[PDB]
Symmetry: D2
């Protein structure tokens, strides 16, 4: 007896997604992560290596690009592909940013072990839905999503979790760029001229 | 303090999401996806450049995950042969914040020459743009201010884009009545 | 007492790579593979789904592009990513082309199992250095590389093996395009105008 | 018969590989790689479009595998922020069959504005082209005929390009004295 129009259904989705974003835990973990990024990339001239699987990995891809776009060299390392030679992308002073909703993604656990064997000094920041997970407990810094309910009709498909992860990405980029004092001239050098209205 | 600054960021991002304009365009977009992919057995081809393109990637994956075959077609690469990915009954989902991204304009022209019946949905910050005007359905981001210190870096725009993606997937999976059984067949056993 | 200049060293590498190509086994397996591609894609209107890991995977990527460029719709499905939802790219009448030098690549074995559970009618062509492997024996068609020695100084890095793989890719494309009678007009529609001198 | 036709294709592809012109340009390219990456600790940024770009992808992986950090930078995506991947001491390896690929020409100009000291090696079928003449080192494919039925599709050209990649990797790993221990560290345990 209770028809709901598509518009109203979508407005509720907006409220749920917006609420998930408002609920992102904000602790001194952010300051610690931003300090690591500034120290390792901006000062020591390493690069930020991001990784994840599935939709979470695609957010990691987007975070690497946003950092490149804001003067923090960054590359996505596919965690399966790492095991077939791509691990050799790693250089001295690099920093890892890993995304794992579960905190126990097989390829990410495997990547951390292999990366540590190659360079035990490498640090990692983890973005996860589960701060009690192995990856979270082993991380140098753990950023939690707050573990919002997915808006998937089955409660399963990454939706609100991935929206939260992209915001955590934005936060890291914006706080870092404030510290590095990234300029509009440096922005222009990393983009085609249309970005400056030329 | 950094904590207060991040809280302000969260307010701005959440407000951008709350501000996404909701019209009958969503139902029209969902009906096209249901018709072309669910009924006619085409696939959803997504595209974009830069960070917006990476959102387009994530949307394709989300659709595959929920029973709507979907692939990302790089709009520059399309012009070097990858356009041949296109099959009868496919549907394009194009993401362009400006609504005039060079490679997306080029993609639309080449795709139209290949198959003039192909339709497209565009997600854009500028519904008055060429791409928007030519689209079969236009979904606006509401063009929120970026939270970038320079006002330039895609941040709130790409967060909105990912949410629009989520919306399309959720409303589609309602219509197609996608089941947990079919979810489980598209994922490793840990997902059950 | 026996210095070898770089030019002479490189000439030897060319001889070795060229010989690997000459040595590619040519049997009726090619006709069977081409028949499957023509049947599934050209007649039944499925698409060709390629996959591999590491450098072999990048050859799989290149084959998908070459097929698209010649009128055989094709996409690369990353075999790890398949397990996180991307398996849903698969449609009725699709055909798999898998590349595994060892013929036991973890993610490829996992992919075939998962794909078979989704659609047991799906067939696969495997390109491999080991025709006695599990993937080779399970395949509908097995195309062997001949297993050339790598030109790597350690004998390990994929070099001659991936050169052969890309050639096997070229063979499948050329023989299929003969059968489909792909035209210059159809080529033109899948490329920018510079490709036609326009 | 198909067997005879395939045998002919093998001959053509093998001959293309044998015909790769070998000059001091290889030593010059390997010295740049060893200097910029091995000595100065930069990374090798590869790029290309279309199938040639997928060869550039495979070269980056092969260098990583052999102790030369390397990453593929998509030349269109570079113009949307990804150019910021570039670090001091990096070296570019560009693949353009025509030697005038729009995105690669655009990439060189943007890269040069970012860091005028950046050098580039170009692999091309046309050593008289703009990209070729402005490169620090030009490695030519010998522009073999394609085995495509139309003479169009990159086949022999891309086979030559992958071999040129193998050459650079092998000659570089000789100079760097890369060891099995270091190989094993960049691969899963099955590789040992
Ligand atoms: N050792 C493991 C690893 C994972 N899982 C389960 O497998 C599912 C998928 O988790 P994942 O393999 O770590 O993969 C990711 C992840 O990062 O968690 C990928 C990401 O893109 C997204 O698809 C999320 C989902 O949001 C589910 O967590 O899943 C989860 O329910 C997880 O609890 C498990 O039971 N045991
Ligand atoms: N014919 C064009 C095309 C673009 N532009 C300008 O170039 C800039 C970049 O727009 P784009 O090339 O279309 O690229 C995208 C886009 O989709 O709009 C890519 C996307 O990932 C993201 O980086 C957005 C930015 O959010 C800015 O729009 O930019 C914008 O300021 C746009 O107005 C322009 O002036 N003229
Ligand atoms: N169950 C398995 C799987 C693999 N291996 C070993 O692991 C190594 C890597 O093989 P792979 O993981 O299957 O990966 C690939 C492969 O497809 O074989 C990827 C490809 O890009 C290329 O790097 C090749 C190498 O050429 C070695 O085969 O390796 C090989 O020595 C193989 O014999 C193994 O011992 N047991
Ligand atoms: N300013 C330009 C640029 C390109 N072209 C022409 O456009 C075609 C495609 O060349 P490209 O855009 O540079 O693209 C590549 C290239 O790198 O040359 C990509 C590569 O993967 C492969 O598809 C090759 C072909 O092998 C043809 O060169 O093409 C060629 O015929 C070239 O001569 C042109 O006429 N004018």
């Amino acid at each position: 007896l209770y028809f709901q129009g598509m518009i109203e259904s979508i407005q509720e989705l907006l409220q749920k997604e917006a609420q998930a974003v408002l609920n992102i835990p904000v602790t001194d973990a952010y300051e610690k992560a931003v300090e690591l990024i500034v120290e390792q990339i901006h000062r020591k001239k390493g690069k930020l290596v991001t990784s994840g699987m599935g939709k979470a990995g695609q957010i990691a891809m987007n975070i690497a690009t946003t950092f490149c776009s804001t003067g923090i060299p960054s590359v996505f390392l596919h965690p399966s592909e790492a095991q077939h030679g791509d691990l050799g992308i790693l250089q001295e002073n690099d920093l890892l940013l890993l995304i794992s909703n579960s905190g126990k993604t097989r390829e990410i656990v495997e990547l951390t072990q292999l990366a540590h064997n190659l360079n035990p000094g490498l640090k990692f920041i983890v973005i996860t839905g589960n701060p009690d997970s192995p990856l979270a407990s082993e991380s140098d810094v753990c950023l939690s999503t707050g573990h919002p309910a997915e808006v998937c009709t089955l409660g399963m498909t990454p939706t609100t979790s991935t929206t939260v992860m992209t915001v955590i990405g934005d936060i890291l980029v914006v706080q870092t760029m404030k510290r590095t004092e990234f300029t509009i001239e440096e922005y222009s050098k990393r983009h085609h001229g249309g970005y400056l209205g030329e």
